[PDB]
RNA sequence: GUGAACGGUGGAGCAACACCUGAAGGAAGGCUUGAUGAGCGUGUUCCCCGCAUACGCGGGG
């Protein structure tokens, strides 16, 4: 990777660094993540709400889009 | 297959016009280039200082 995130044409965003290293288990909230709509209860927080988006692989797929529970940005 | 992928802030436009740095104001009052240094007296062994180390040298008045 060298540059994140969109109109990455235009040069924006590219990445200075990146470090990964583990983490606990109750220390990482994954499910922070458009989750289907009949994901386990768990893993929906507040922040997950009901919408109309894809849950995997394109994003922009709006054909893919399905009933999904996933948070905000 | 980064809600990605694609996407010109662009084109044009006078900081310019006119405007006295100028009026007044004493470099003067006093001051020998004249000297100064240019020539005019003593008539024979008397103190003291160093090198020596006394055989003598230099030397103060």
Redesign the pocket.
């Known amino acids: 990777?060298?540059?994140?995130?969109?109109?990455?044409?235009?040069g924006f965003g590219q990445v200075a660094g990146f470090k990964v290293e583990p983490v606990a288990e109750t220390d990482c909230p994954w499910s922070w993540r458009?989750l289907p709509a009949d994901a386990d209860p768990r893993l929906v927080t507040s922040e997950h709400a009901r919408?109309?988006?894809?849950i995997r692989?394109?994003?922009?797929?709006?054909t893919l889009?399905v009933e999904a529970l996933?948070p905000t940005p």
Not at 57 to 62: C, E, Q, S, T
């Open positions: 990777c060298r540059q994140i995130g969109g109109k990455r044409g235009v458009a919408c109309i988006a894809a692989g394109p994003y922009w797929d709006r889009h996933a």
